Design the sequence.
């Protein structure tokens, strides 16, 4: 019941092993490898989006 | 051009000619509550024409020395028709909103408003270990007013513009869904606001969902012959309003 | 593996395209890249927005309260200590949590227990190893009123025992809210007539901890001081808000004194002078 | 049993531990999850939002809302300096308390470009031009408009489109600067000059107000956690 | 993964169907769903009857008795202590077990041992670590009558040794009944002529524990107090019965004083008044 | 001789590993994942069952 | 032997532990299991049974 | 839990240890690697370079 | 598995090939094998250049500084101690690192903590086990100014706690430079006008450690002395340079007194005499 | 997620097992089995290389 995933290494130059030992999901370690984002709801939060080259309020 | 915008919600229509755009929340448009996120078990009430329509609040006058205004918004529409009555007869309410603010001038006036829509604006007190009365956080459709200096009234909010009544920097207050009313380009500011709360439905008297704030950064200024009285008029329309738990009228 | 965006090369331009002219009056943040204004080269950028995520920012253990209790006294209330559970009595963990309005996280709790022999006439003793008991009472349970009270039995309540000299005790705690997120701020009242208390003090309701020495009355007083470390993990966070400028005053309200917005410069234009 | 050997680092409590620990409440039924608008998955989503810069923090203007207003008006000759500050998002007193300054003050290294947006809050009948210059260090401060136009600059014309963007390019020796102040990683000077004056017609006010904004670009980063220099408590919050 | 039942939608009705009219005189509990009386919507309900099962309800460690014994005395009976094994001397674990009439479970036993130096003139000693011995005697075995008696050898009897400062000792125990379930209540006599004792005291017969210090006579008295924690696991339970209203009196019978059925209201109709 | 089974997680958003180490069945952990029930012997304990819409004692 | 590291939470007694522990009586022959009517697998089976409400709890 | 036995050599600090130890800064983003001329992978690369011998080390 | 080069056999030669004649004026080291000058046999050579690699040469734990602090004093600055982090105060690890100009390595840090009871009148105490705290402050953080200061909370800063008698505490540290390699030498100034400080003191900037006793004021003074051991691992090294002849003087500069190049012989030609 | 590699043994007369346990690459053990070298940049650092038998500065 083991899982292999890559480590945090640098660029231009791994595979640790994790096994969960407790019956609850609240005992698991922190999920410190989710690097995704979406700033489309804080920047650009408008209706009728703008095209960055047009005067846009033309 | 895209500066002309028209909005129809029910039997009320707003046509503007110098609009800018429409900010829609955090990208989410107001919709009804699904059966997966629902908690209560009984049938809700969806009026959808007698409720979802524009209600016009009081106009406030903007002098050169005005500092700001705020309205609490499930509470400023307490006595506005069947929205207020359906608030008084039900226990659980859930709605989105559309906040349109009018302010007009000429090409000889200058100034700049900031229209912010702040969720969970838990405000401070004037005296630190003191209780705030409910007539000072909200007053219905009559606006409360910020002050320029440190206010120290009894049972009142700390009214200072450089802390917005909440204890933060007022320049950093643009993280919320906002627009500007700049008097050389704008005429109005439309903000579509969905339902943001930690629970799927909530009571509409015990809770304050959000707080509209209009704060002038660039002060109003004009010459010795221009018009002095410049009003600011706020109009609000609930969206996707539904209601649950019918019982007798009251709030206690 | 998600990189940041590369910088694309550009050349000279002369046209009716205007990326620098915009209008911030629509509440819109301009998406201007440096390759829209000046001539830039091609840069393969390998930076990762890794240690800025909401998981990596909050998942650090933080002291939330200091709890002090003794092992022999004249008055029985100083032989045990209790704490109504909140994260709002140390300003660092509070100000880190108040970036957001609603949060959802599992908690990891670690206790650090240290013992100091108090000053007395008979300090020359031979004391065996102290054992401490940390009992958590869910909201509504019975409250112990002495160190020898029979509510310390932990038949249903969670508890932990630590013998002196070991590693610190650690347990995990799931998401315990009755709503869908821990409301960091609550703008509202407690009663339906809009009276009572104003603020987040209505929605706290998390229970309270209890601390005592399992050993009986010793022949010398020893002051125990246990420190609670919270670690928020499995984090979700919603609807951000600006950080606090002013210094806090209390735990139950949000009230303050007005503070200046920033530090003064005493001039407005820089120069090559004493700046 | 199984023969094992304890290494150094046993029986310690490190604050950055990432181990597993048993639950105090087994089989606890967590409440279901509800889709709430405005989820934050990264603080860099927050740091890319524009927010107003208190440029006019001069000797008790911070205890009012006047600290945000940049005074500008019609000049006598030409070519005077409007305002100025140093590019230190997190150490300079101008953009210290801004949202970019707060989030960068919870970090120790930073990297990437910076947008500066300027909104003109004057009258619809007034015109004017400005020079928004960036100067990398090594020399001093540019002392006139002639020395300022030798760097990264932009001429901004005031018209229908009411706001301009000065996008400060990432020009550095290293990959990361420091958020706190040191001589080695110095970043430069943001300065603003009169290209042409503010020409205004009759019966219109002469003195007007510029507002300023700051945010991060899409290539921006932060690396090292630390505690903020702003939190100062003495006792508890009873 | 077993959910609770969803709520199905309904509409207006006018017919000879009567779900609300029933007769409870047949001993039948009506299966009326809220979608039979009022108009309800469709609710996808995700609740799980998880922490209400008989396994999750009883499997919690509970203190059953406190055992006290010393390390040097004038009288030899105060240097060791014994306990006839029953679960009916603490009211919490007893009242949790008396929901059912017959039960079948494995037991998990944990001892918590604490030592307190007694008050004397020569408290300034240097005592090495105490070692305690907990010997279980199955029903019928030989009984030790001193701390130096030769019945403490544990040639066949189970035993456990604990040195001071370690983790608490823990062992598991299988189902030990001579019948098919632990009879929580026994309505009957001991003798066939219906005399003797009345109650569950005939079917207890579980053995008895013995506690002593392995060390010899020390030069200072130390009072040891060991607490027994039972944890019922692998649980089966049969034929439920109502919980007890009245406070208990003894361990061997079920006898009581009559208590009122509930707390009084002093009125019978509510109002909006001082209620 | 390992067994993989799911953890207790919430709705709308696992796989721990267990190995038994002792020769007896009385040493195993508690069976805290049996969520089944049958209230047909406490509710509805009758002969000639009732159909919930008929008068039932008609 | 095998190098291991002790985490916090070692050598404690939590009441809600769910670990494994050795038997004091190995190879103990348990008595067989008999089908007894009225098995309870859930307290919610008990809580769904009707029971009489003392409404008239007024002053003795 | 798992029964284990400690060998001699436990709880010591040998200078030539080659074990694993937890990071004080988890998920620390290391700066990228740059090709620099003159990489040394072995001191025997250095020891094979000619260098001048002080033969005339006689009395100051 | 990489062997050294074998010796190939050779025979007598008489030709215009001249492997022994070269010119070192081109900066070229001659590649002369012993089978080019004399007659050699065939030797299968099994030596391995294993324990001469840059990884095996530097990866040894080395004491870098001694840190001394007490547990009760009149002056509060002698109850905690601090150290600005550098590898240039012990000459062995410094002279091993100064073979190269630029290095890139992960660090493995081990602390060895020993306690000595100071001389006093009341040495006959019974002190429980001391617990020490080692807090690392990244460059720019807040500085504690007492043992009871509230900056010791470690809400964000890394820390480690050690109870007396365990194994030494050990943690690993990644590559922390803002450039691409730890510059062992920096030939340059700090200010752009070529004033300020000269040397590698500009590029140190690594933070500083803090040491205290977690316990409170004890009734007898105890002097703690903790030794820091660095172990450079995952090593890369660039552009070598000759080792230092002269003895060091300070940590911040490279300055010296002139030393003779080698040890004198007092003659120039060997003989079979008293040599 | 295990890796098997040979041990350091002598000539003329193994296979240990390593598993990484931590999420970072900075926790791994030392790489003490890279025995490669290249003294072509310290010895022979010239343009127009020499052929060891020719006079080479002929
Ligand atoms: C003895 C074992 C159990 C230990 C119990 C100690 C802590 C119990 C409560 C768990 C943590 C809840 C802390 C509060 C969470 C949120 O941050 C607050 N509601 C405010 O956001
Ligand atoms: C020293 C190692 C063995 C430890 C022996 C201690 C306990 C021995 C008896 C095991 C537990 C039986 C307790 C009684 C079970 C039932 O609850 C009662 N008969 C009443 O229901
Ligand atoms: C408390 C846990 C963290 C422990 C922190 C202690 C050491 C922190 C710095 C890590 C080691 C850096 C030492 C210096 C490296 C280079 O050798 C120097 N820059 C000179 O070459």
Sequence:
């Amino acid at each position: 019941g083991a899982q292999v995933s890559t480590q945090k290494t640098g660029a231009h130059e791994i595979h640790y092993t994790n096994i969960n030992y407790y019956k609850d999901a609240a005992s698991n370690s922190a999920n410190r490898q989710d690097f995704t984002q979406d700033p489309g709801k804080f920047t650009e939060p408008v209706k009728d989006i703008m095209v960055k080259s047009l005067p846009a309020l033309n | 051009s895209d500066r002309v915008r028209s909005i129809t919600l029910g039997n009320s229509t707003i046509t503007t000619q110098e609009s800018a755009n429409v900010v829609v929340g955090y990208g989410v448009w107001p919709d009804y509550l699904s059966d997966e996120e629902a908690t209560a078990e009984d049938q809700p009430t969806q009026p959808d024409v007698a409720t979802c329509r524009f209600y016009t609040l009081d106009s406030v006058s903007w002098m050169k020395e005005s500092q700001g205004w705020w309205w609490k918004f499930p509470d400023a529409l307490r006595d506005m028709g069947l929205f207020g009555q359906n608030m008084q007869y039900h226990y659980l309410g859930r709605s989105g909103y559309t906040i349109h603010v009018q302010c007009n001038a000429s090409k000889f006036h200058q100034g700049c408003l900031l229209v912010v829509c702040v969720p969970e604006a838990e405000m401070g007190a004037a005296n630190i270990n003191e209780k705030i009365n409910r007539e000072h956080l909200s007053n219905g459709e009559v606006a409360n007013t910020f002050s320029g200096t440190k206010s120290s009234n009894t049972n009142d909010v700390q009214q200072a513009v450089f802390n917005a009544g909440m204890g933060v920097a007022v320049g950093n207050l643009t993280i919320f869904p906002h627009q500007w009313i700049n008097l050389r380009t704008n005429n109005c500011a439309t903000i579509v606001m969905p339902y943001i709360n930690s629970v799927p439905m909530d009571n509409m008297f015990r809770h304050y969902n959000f707080t509209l704030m209009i704060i002038p950064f660039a002060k109003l200024d004009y010459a010795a012959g221009s018009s002095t009285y410049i009003p600011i008029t706020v109009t609000v329309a609930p969206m996707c309003a539904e209601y649950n738990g019918l019982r007798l009228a009251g709030h206690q | 593996v998600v990189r940041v965006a590369d910088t694309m090369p550009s050349g000279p331009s002369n046209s009716e395209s205007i990326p620098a002219l915009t209008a911030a009056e629509t509440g819109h943040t301009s998406q201007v890249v440096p390759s829209d204004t000046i001539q830039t080269r091609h840069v393969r950028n390998f930076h990762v927005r890794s240690e800025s995520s909401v998981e990596n920012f909050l998942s650090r253990s933080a002291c939330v309260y200091i709890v002090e209790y003794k092992t022999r006294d004249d008055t029985p209330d100083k032989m045990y200590d209790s704490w109504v559970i909140n994260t709002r009595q140390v300003a660092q963990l509070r100000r880190k949590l108040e970036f957001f309005t609603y949060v959802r996280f599992d908690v990891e709790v670690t206790f650090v227990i240290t013992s100091v022999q108090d000053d007395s006439t008979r300090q020359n003793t031979d004391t065996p190893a102290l054992t401490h008991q940390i009992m958590y009472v869910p909201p509504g349970g019975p409250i112990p009123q002495a160190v020898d009270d029979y509510n310390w039995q932990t038949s249903t309540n969670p508890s932990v025992f630590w013998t002196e000299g070991n590693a610190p005790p650690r347990m995990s705690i799931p998401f315990m809210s009755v709503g869908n997120a821990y409301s960091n701020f609550y703008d509202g009242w407690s009663h339906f007539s809009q009276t009572g208390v104003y603020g987040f003090n209505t929605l706290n309701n998390m229970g309270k901890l209890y601390f005592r020495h399992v050993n009986d009355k010793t022949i010398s007083p020893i002051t125990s001081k246990v420190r609670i470390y919270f670690k928020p993990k499995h984090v979700k966070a919603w609807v951000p808000r600006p950080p606090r400028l002013c210094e806090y005053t209390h735990k139950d309200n949000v009230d303050f004194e007005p503070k200046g917005v920033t530090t003064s410069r005493t001039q407005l234009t820089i120069s090559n002078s004493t700046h | 049993g199984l023969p094992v050997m304890n290494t150094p680092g046993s029986n310690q409590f490190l604050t950055s531990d990432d181990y597993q620990s048993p639950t105090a409440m087994p089989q606890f039924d967590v409440t279901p999850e509800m889709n709430i608008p405005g989820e934050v998955k990264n603080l860099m989503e927050i740091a890319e939002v524009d927010s107003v810069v208190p440029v006019n923090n001069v000797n008790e203007n911070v205890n009012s809302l006047e600290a945000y207003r940049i005074p500008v008006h019609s000049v006598t000759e030409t070519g005077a300096q409007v305002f100025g500050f140093t590019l230190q998002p997190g150490a300079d007193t101008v953009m210290e308390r801004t949202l970019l300054g707060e989030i960068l003050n919870y970090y120790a290294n930073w990297s990437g470009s910076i947008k500066l947006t300027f909104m003109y809050c004057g009258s619809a009948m007034a015109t004017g031009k400005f020079l928004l210059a960036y100067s990398p260090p090594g020399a001093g401060v540019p002392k006139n408009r002639r020395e300022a136009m030798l760097g990264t600059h932009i001429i901004w014309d005031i018209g229908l489109q009411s706001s301009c963007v000065l996008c400060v390019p990432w020009i550095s020796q290293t990959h990361y600067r420091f958020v706190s102040k040191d001589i080695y990683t110095d970043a430069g000077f943001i300065t603003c000059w009169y290209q042409t004056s503010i020409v205004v017609p009759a019966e219109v006010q002469n003195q007007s107000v510029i507002l300023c904004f700051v945010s991060a670009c899409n290539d921006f980063s932060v690396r090292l956690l630390r505690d903020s220099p702003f939190v100062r408590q003495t006792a508890f919050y009873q």
About this structure: Residues H 24; I 85, 87, 97, 107, 109, 134, 136, 158-160, 171, 173, 182, 184, 206-207, 209 surround sphingosine (ligand 3) (CB under 6 Å). The domain at 1-238 of chain D is CATH 2.60.120.20 (Jelly Rolls).
